[PDB]
Amino acid sequence: IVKPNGEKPDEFESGISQALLELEMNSDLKAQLRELNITAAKEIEVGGGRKAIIIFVPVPQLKSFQKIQVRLVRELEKKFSGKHVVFIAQRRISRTLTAVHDAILEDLVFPSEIVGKRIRVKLDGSRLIKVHLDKAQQNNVEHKVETFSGVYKKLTGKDVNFEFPEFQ
Amino acid sequence: ERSEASLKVSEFNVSSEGSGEKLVLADLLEPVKTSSSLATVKKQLSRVKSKKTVELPLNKEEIERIHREVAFNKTAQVLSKWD
Amino acid sequence: PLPSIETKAEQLTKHLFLLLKDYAKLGAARGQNFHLVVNCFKCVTILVKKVKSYQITEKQLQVLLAYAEEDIYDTSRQATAFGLLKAILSRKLLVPEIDEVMRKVSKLAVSAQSEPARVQCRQVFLKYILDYPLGDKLRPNLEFMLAQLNYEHETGRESTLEMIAYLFDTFPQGLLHENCGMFFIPLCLMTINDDSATCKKMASMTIKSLLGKISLEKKDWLFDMVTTWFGAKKRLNRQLAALICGLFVESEGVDFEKRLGTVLPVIEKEIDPENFKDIMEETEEKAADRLLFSFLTLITKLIKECNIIQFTKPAETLSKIWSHVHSHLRHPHNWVWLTAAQIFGLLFASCQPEELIQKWPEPVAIKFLASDLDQKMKSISLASCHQLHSKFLDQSLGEQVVKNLLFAAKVLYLLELYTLLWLIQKLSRIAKLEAAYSPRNPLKRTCIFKFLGAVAMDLGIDKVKPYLPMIIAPLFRELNSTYSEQDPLLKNLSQEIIELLKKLVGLESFSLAFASVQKQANEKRALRKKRKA
Amino acid sequence: ISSVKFNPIETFLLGSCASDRNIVLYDMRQATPLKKVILDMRTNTICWNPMEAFIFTAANEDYNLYTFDMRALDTPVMVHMDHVSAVLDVDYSPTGKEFVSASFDKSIRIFPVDKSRSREVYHTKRMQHVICVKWTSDSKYIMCGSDEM
Incomplete structure (x- = not known):
């Protein structure tokens, strides 16, 4: 299930592939998992003790992974000890740096959509970036905003905060 | 032409409950012949079942929220004195 | 050993209690305040532990508990x-608030x-159970603890088994017998x-620890439950x-007879x-395979823990058992025939080869191979040749x-x-057929090459000579190839095996054997140009 | 956050105003906020009633003043509607029956707590953009600070 760029799979990636096979044949998700594979998997630390798994999947399959994103996240977080799991497409080996960052940010928060962006300049001269998410999916991704900020900081290097506006 | 989806072979890697039926605790106790020791074992296991297992800790957001309702109710009870 | 410590110990205690009063409340340890609280609890613990000097009074211990x-x-x-909480437990503070804290x-x-x-x-909870005199509670x-075995997350479920294994090591014999039925059955589900x-x-190890320190009469009672499960209808x-x-x-151990x-x-x-x-x-196929695999692993445990091979008295059942294991060497599931190959491997290590031919009461397993020895050894070799074609083949499997x-x-x-060429020719054909169809897959060529080197090494220097051209013939084919320069794994393996052949067998005779393969290569290509025309 | 004020009665309570047009109530002992209410426009300053523990008045950008009961934040107790520009500051008389408000329009008004209209308005030609106002402690005088220095 892991197809890296001509390299040996890591122990964590191998474990992710093992869990994916277990879901593939034992559970009732065979019709979708059979055609799907991942590229890489990584674990990072956020929020002073929290842990996040990033599953890098190939781009042409990403849309298909969106069909069963919620089920896979729910199963994998239970398989692990509550660590937050996110699925992200594999962009870096077309698109500029900003486009790649925007695509990563879109994939990172997938159940909720990005509807707006604000920058506030404080009196000290610093800047704060706020990204607006839809109100319809607030309860599903409300607890993962710190995880999203940490993952985006780790991958891109930029500080981003997440909010839910009242008006659509 | 079949495999168990685990690279290493072990009795702990069998991955039971994948297909078929589930096995509850009562299926172990039912067939064995009745005895006084079996009766007290059943009583002990029932008393164990009576105890409550620890729930998963809630997310930080709803923990903070519940803190807000608790504190607000306490403050409202305090403020009702001045009416 | 500072003489000013005793004089200033009274002033130290007031300062530490003030910091604990201020900084141990809710929300008062964020950021820089966190490390102050960490070192404040450590310094108080030293005061509690050293009862000999400037001891903290029992009333103050109740304050520190809060x-x-x-x-x-x-x-x-x-x-x-937690460090302070252990120190209070060592001072044997007996107040009702101890019990409520230990629940948390x-x-x-x-x-x-x-x-x-x-x-x-x-460590705090385990210290509490052993060292306090509350027998009723x-x-x-x-x-x-047993109710906690159903925790949804793995880490919490692992921690419970850590605590259970510690209590099995530390309880007296009498307490362990009273609660034997409580622990054993839920652990079986785990x-x-x-x-x-x-x-x-971990669940298996804590059961074995329970079985180690339990009395023999309780062992029989537990085993009747297992025997009842043996006849149960349910496949699981x-x-x-x-x-x-x-x-x-x-x-x-050796007492299971x-x-x-x-x-x-x-x-x-x-x-x-x-x-x-x-x-x-398909559900029953997997149910059947997991049942069969579990029972074969039981046989493997019997072979190593007990001398089941060197038993003769239950002759009728052993003969039936030892033939069913042979019948499962062709099972499609890879986990099945791997264990079956392990069972037959245990026989071969135990019995020397010249003994079987010399026989060509007695143990049934030896008698099983000895009868129809030519037929049995053909089937074992043929089954092993089939296992190479298995798609789920690995280095450990090979x-x-x-x-x-x-x-x-x-x-x-x-x-x-008193068919070795037939065996070598069969494996040589496999190497030839694979390189023609799929040179990418190196698995079967690796096992065959390791087989050739070990067979030659076991045979004596004179004895390899009648078999030398057939051994080296597949090696020459992979020595130079188009895919060989791409992936040199096979080429390096051939060069390693050839060097042991040069050491084991005379270098001139090796050159004679190697040339014999070379010449047969020359006529075969020469016919190929005629076939081209 | 623009302003924070301690409650003079039940001294552990706090009030606050921020830039997304909300008002937040805190609690010092339990170290947590209590409740949040969002209005149409930003509030500039908040003031507690010195005789009624659960009453506070907010100076808002929508030319208006809102008096609230902190137990029931769903609706304001009263609205005060005499100003024509943004209200910047409010202060209560020590008797707790009136408050005085400053606005970006160059005037200051006195409102009764139970009425929706101002009792009086003060103005001067040399006075412009009153920024801060304090009722004096013997309930006899009013002082204001403006940007003509």
């Missing part, structure tokens, strides 16, 4: 009061996400109904019985091929198959002196 309780309930911060620590031992947090919570604290592998292994119940009975053979009489009739029914001939559902082939190769040789 501060420690407030710390562990603070969800925002990490708990830092017991809950934290399961539900804490931080790994060091669970470790420290376990000791019973509820044990049944609470070995089968758990989702994680490492919890299943039977494989559970095999798995639990597999734990006894280590705990019994008293129970061994009833176990053998049960096994021969399950491993018999007639049961699994016709199954129309090594067991190769070792079985080595024993079959030796036995056929000494039989000829």
